[PDB]
Amino acid sequence: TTILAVSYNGGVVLAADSRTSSGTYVVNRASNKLTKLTKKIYCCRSGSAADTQALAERVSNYLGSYQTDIGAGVNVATAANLFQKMCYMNRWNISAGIIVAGYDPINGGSVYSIPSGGSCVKLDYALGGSGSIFLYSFFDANYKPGMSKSECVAFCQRAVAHAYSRDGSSGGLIRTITLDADEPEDQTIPWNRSPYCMEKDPKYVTQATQNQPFSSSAKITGNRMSST
Amino acid sequence: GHDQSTDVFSAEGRVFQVEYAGKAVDNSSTAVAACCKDGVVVAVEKVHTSRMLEKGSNNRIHAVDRQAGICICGLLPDGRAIVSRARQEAENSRDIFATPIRGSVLANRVGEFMHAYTTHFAYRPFGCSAIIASYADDGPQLFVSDPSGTVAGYYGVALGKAKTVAKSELEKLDFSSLTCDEAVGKLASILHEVHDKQKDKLYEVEVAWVCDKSDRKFVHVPADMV
Numbered sequence: 445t446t447i448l449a450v451s452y453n454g455g456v457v458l459a460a461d462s463r464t465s466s467g468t469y470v471v472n473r474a475s476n477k478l479t480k481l482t483k484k485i486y487c488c489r490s491g492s493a494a495d496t497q498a499l500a501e502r503v504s505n506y507l508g509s510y511q512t513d514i515g516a517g518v519n520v521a522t523a524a525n526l527f528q529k530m531c532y533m534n535r536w537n538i539s540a541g542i543i544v545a546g547y548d549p550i551n552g553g554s555v556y557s558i559p560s561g562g563s564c565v566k567l568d569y570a571l572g573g574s575g576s577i578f579l580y581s582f583f584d585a586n587y588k589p590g591m592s593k594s595e596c597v598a599f600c601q602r603a604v605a606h607a608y609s610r611d612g613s614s615g616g617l618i619r620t621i622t623l624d625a626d627e628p629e630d631q632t633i634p635w636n637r638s639p640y641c642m643e644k645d646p647k648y649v650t651q652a653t654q655n656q657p658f659s660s661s662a663k664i665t666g667n668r669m670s671s672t
Numbered sequence: 673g674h675d676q677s678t679d680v681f682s683a684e685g686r687v688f689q690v691e692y693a694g695k696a697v698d699n700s701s702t703a704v705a706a707c708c709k710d711g712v713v714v715a716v717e718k719v720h721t722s723r724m725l726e727k728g729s730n731n732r733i734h735a736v737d738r739q740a741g742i743c744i745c746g747l748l749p750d751g752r753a754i755v756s757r758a759r760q761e762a763e764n765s766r767d768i769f770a771t772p773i774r775g776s777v778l779a780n781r782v783g784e785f786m787h788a789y790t791t792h793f794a795y796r797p798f799g800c801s802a803i804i805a806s807y808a809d810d811g812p813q814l815f816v817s818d819p820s821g822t823v824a825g826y827y828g829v830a831l832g833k834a835k836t837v838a839k840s841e842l843e844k845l846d847f848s849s850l851t852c853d854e855a856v857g858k859l860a861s862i863l864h865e866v867h868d869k870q871k872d873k874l875y876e877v878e879v880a881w882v883c884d885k886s887d888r889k890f891v892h893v894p895a896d897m898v
Contacts, residue, residue, distance in 0.1 A: 516774070
């Protein structure tokens with residue numbers, strides 16, 4: 445899993461790969477890990493599909509009740525707070541990295557990370573999933589904040605692609621959604637138009653030279669490609 | 673036997689035990705309140721029976737959260753029960769929803785709670801009207817929940833024994849223009865006019881506001897403005 449969210453001026457992007465794996469087999473290659481909580485507030489789920497689907501459904505339910513009751517929009521902080529509560533109450537029995545991100549008119553776009561222990565941290569961007577370990581340096585090196593919506597979408601797609609090109613546990617599509625004052629725009633990049641992969645990076649086209657032919661010299665030539 | 677329990681309708685669909693609790697509120701000391709564009713001011717006439725109370729005794733105005741307060745009118749103990757419930761709702765909003773409770777929400781919650789005690793043979797209605805004054809994200813707001821649990825928003829409001837007069841005086845104010853500074857003066861002034869002197873010889877007027885000058889915190893007003 446690779447999930448992330450990034451703020452831009454006036455909203456957020458969420459992004460995720462689509463793969464759900466039972467270890468080394470892919471049970472679902474088109475999962476949707478961007479889960480709607482309210483109209484403009486989403487979570488990205490990582491960890492146990494079961495656990496995260498159960499919490500998201502629970503929180504989305506509570507939040508719809510709550511919106512009907514106060515007769516007004518919900519804040520992202522409220523959604524994060526609830527998520528945090530539930531994640532923390534059940535921290536021993538669930539595996540669950542969440543990101544809660546969305547747009548509310550009081551605070552603009554926000555991002556909260558709620559990692560396994562049930563901390564809740566408000567950030568500019570957040571990463572989660574097994575694939576996130578690959579993006580920390582990518583962000584450190586290549587993410588400048590203050591990006592436009594469209595730049596930010598493309599950057600999150602790149603970021604996911606980089607992650608899932610190295611994490612065996614992430615893969616497939618890249619789903620994104622933006623969340624701001626306007627209508628949510630979901631997007632889905634199929635793998636074969638991924639903005640990065642190792643199988644198409646020109647610096648990984650030359651094969652490692654492992655299968656040298658038997659020679660009278662130490663000079664390395666190439667792999668032996670043919671018997672003759 | 674139609675009027676002994678709040679669990680019972682009369683033949684005209686009235687609930688007498690609620691009307692009766694209502695009378696407790698009307699025979700009580702008077703409160704007024706005004707909701708301006710910059711905040712809410714609520715004032716209330718405390719009637720002492722003794723010359724020897726401490727100033728502060730039997731406060732009828734309670735904070736319920738940073739941004740909200742409840743002035744009770746009627747049986748003060750019953751009101752402190754409501755104030756406790758309002759505070760639990762305010763806490764819940766902060767603890768679960770990580771937001772200050774909007775005032776309309778708070779007053780609805782207060783109303784629901786008061787109404788609940790008008791449905792069941794085992795409890796009686798509360799003998800107090802709560803005035804709720806909030807200034808959360810929904811803006812300045814002033815509600816009143818009566819013993820039936822009916823809740824209404826007001827620009828200005830008067831409860832208790834001088835309510836009919838105090839309303840006549842509150843109608844003379846211009847709510848569109850009036851500011852929390854002016855209102856502390858007016859609302860207090862009003863409670864001095866409608867106070868009856870030969871009955872209730874000992875009285876202070878407690879005032880509180882929540883407004884832009886108080887950093888939208890609900891507080892007793894300093895006793896220089898009165």
